Amino acid sequence: TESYCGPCPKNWICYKNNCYQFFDEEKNWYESQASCMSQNASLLKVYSKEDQDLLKLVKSYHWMGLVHGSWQWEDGSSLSPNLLTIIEMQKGDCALYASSFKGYIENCSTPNTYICMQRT
């Protein structure tokens, strides 16, 4: 059964109506967030293991929009339970995504590659 996906800009991957773009130039969390904002987007937000099962295929670790009450996303929403295994890697208030559905606590100032996400 075929269906259309998006909408998304042309250079973004579309999957279950979310749009993803990988950035390989390393930036700290704040610079990564600013980069995504300049593309009318945000850093990766993880909300569903089903809608976002493609994240099982992501290799290496990349900034997502999770920051430190509890951890929260850029949009102010809380991290849903039973989505990510949080592991402590560095003293930090930001998190990297790693497969499969892990979040590494990371110094916000450390340069990393990053994933932007859009949903119209």
Q: Which residues bind a copy of itself (CB under 8 A)?
A: 1-16, 22, 39-40, 53-54, 57, 59, 120
115 binds, among a copy of itself, ligand VMQ, none (CB under 5 to 8 A by kind): ligand VMQ
Dig out the tokens for 19 from the structure. 């749009």
Nearer to a copy of itself, 13 or 83 (CB): 13
Q: How far apart (Å, rounded) are the C-alpha atoms in residues 2 and 109?
A: 43
Beta strands in 47-101 (DSSP E): 62-67, 72-73, 85-88, 94-98
Residues 17-76 that bind ligand VMQ (CB under 6 A): 20-22, 54, 57-60
